[PDB]
């Protein structure tokens, strides 16, 4: 950790004025402590201590000189430097995140279960516009042996229900083991 041999401030700071910089970007607080000469092995080195916010307890040594204040302030920067590694699992467990609502389409997922459990997926339709107030009759087949024929009030109400009819049918289709 030794390096500078010309540091030692006497007006303002130095690596501290730098440390004091990012600490303001995180909204933390610089709290310096001091426990000089404590090494039992007659090693009267300088063991300083310094926190960043109010929950950590980092520290370092540099002997009796700037190396102490610099080591304490220097190693503090090495803190944010690190912590950049991921430590949480994969996805989070929040009950919100993006909007759920699952898929909103339907004619699309029907073609999905088709190639999934290999089946047929097509849609035909015969609008019943005889007098007018009559309605719209649609016809569609899905599965491998079922004709999802469906009728709707509007050409659009039909299509969506067209899938729903067969789609909700594959769910009810308990046949698919080999008979």
Swiss-Prot record:
The modification Phosphotyrosine is found at residues 106, 167. The modification Phosphothreonine is found at residues 93-95. The modification N-acetylalanine is found at residue 7. Changing residue 102 to F: In LEUDEN; uncertain significance. Highly expressed in thymus, spleen and bone marrow compared to non-hematopoietic tissues such as small intestine, liver, or kidney tissues. Colocalizes with GSK3B and TAU in the Alzheimer disease (AD) brain. Elevated levels seen in breast and colon carcinomas, and which correlates with tumor progression and invasiveness or risk of progression. Autophosphorylated on several Ser, Thr and Tyr residues. Autophosphorylation apparently leads to the activation of the kinase. Tyrosine autophosphorylation is essential for efficient dsRNA-binding, dimerization, and kinase activation. Residues 14-82, 105-172 form the DRBM domain. Residues 7-175 are annotated as: (Microbial infection) Interaction with HCV NS5A. It is found in: Cytoplasm; Nucleus; Cytoplasm, Perinuclear region. The modification Phosphoserine is found at residue 88. Induction: By type I interferons. There is a cross-link at residues 74, 164 (Glycyl lysine isopeptide (Lys-Gly) (interchain with G-Cter in ISG15)). Changing residue 119 to Q: Found in a patient with dysmorphic facies, syndactyly, congenital microcephaly and global developmental delay; uncertain significance. Changing residue 37 to S: In LEUDEN; uncertain significance. IFN-induced dsRNA-dependent serine/threonine-protein kinase that phosphorylates the alpha subunit of eukaryotic translation initiation factor 2 (EIF2S1/eIF-2-alpha) and plays a key role in the innate immune response to viral infection. Contains 2 dsRNA-binding domain (DRBM). The N-terminus contains the catalytic domain dimerization. The C-terminus binds EIF2S1/EIF2-alpha. Belongs to the protein kinase superfamily. Ser/Thr protein kinase family. GCN2 subfamily. Homodimer. Interacts with STRBP. Interacts with DNAJC3. Forms a complex with FANCA, FANCC, FANCG and HSP70. Interacts with ADAR/ADAR1. Interacts with IRS1. The inactive form interacts with NCK1 and GSN. Interacts (via the kinase catalytic domain) with STAT3 (via SH2 domain), TRAF2 (C-terminus), TRAF5 (C-terminus) and TRAF6 (C-terminus). Interacts with MAP2K6, IKBKB/IKKB, NPM1, TARBP2, NLRP1, NLRP3, NLRC4 and AIM2. Interacts (via DRBM 1 domain) with DUS2L (via DRBM domain). Interacts with DHX9 (via N-terminus) and this interaction is dependent upon activation of the kinase. It is linked to Leukoencephalopathy, developmental delay, and episodic neurologic regression syndrome: An autosomal dominant disorder characterized by global developmental delay apparent in early childhood, cognitive impairment, ataxia, poor or absent speech with dysarthria, hypotonia, hypertonia, extrapyramidal signs, tremor, and abnormal involuntary movements. Affected individuals also exhibit neurological regression in the setting of febrile illness or infection. Many patients have seizures. Brain imaging shows diffuse white matter abnormalities with poor myelination. Dystonia 33: A form of dystonia, a disorder defined by the presence of sustained involuntary muscle contraction, often leading to abnormal postures. DYT33 is a slowly progressive form characterized by onset of focal or generalized dystonia in the first decades of life. Disease manifestations are variable. Some patients show ambulation difficulties, dysarthria, or dysphagia. Some affected individuals may manifest motor delay, lower limb spasticity, and mild developmental delay with intellectual disability. DYT33 penetrance is incomplete. Inheritance can be autosomal dominant or recessive. This is Interferon-induced, double-stranded RNA-activated protein kinase. The lineage of its organism: Eukaryota, Metazoa, Chordata, Craniata, Vertebrata. The chain holds residues 1 to 170 of 551 of the full protein.
């Amino acid at each position: 950790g030794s390096h500078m041999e010309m540091a030692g401030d006497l007006s303002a700071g130095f690596f501290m004025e730098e440390l004091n910089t990012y600490r303001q970007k995180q909204g933390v607080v610089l709290k310096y402590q001091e426990l000089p000469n404590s090494g039992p092995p007659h090693d009267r080195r300088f063991t300083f201590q310094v926190i960043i916010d109010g929950r950590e307890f980092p520290e370092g040594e540099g002997r009796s000189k700037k190396e102490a204040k610099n080591a304490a302030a220097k190693l503090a920067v090495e803190i944010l430097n690190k912590e950049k590694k991921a430590v949480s699992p994969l996805l989070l467990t929040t009950t919100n995140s993006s909007e759920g609502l699952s898929m909103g389409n339907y004619i699309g997922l029907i073609n999905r279960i088709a190639q999934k459990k290999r089946l047929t997926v097509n849609y035909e339709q015969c609008a019943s516009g005889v007098h007018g107030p009559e309605g719209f009759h649609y016809k569609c087949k899905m599965g491998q042996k079922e004709y999802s024929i469906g009728t709707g009030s509007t050409k659009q109400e039909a299509k969506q229900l067209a899938a729903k009819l067969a789609y909700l049918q594959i769910l009810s289709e308990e046949t698919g083991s080999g008979c």
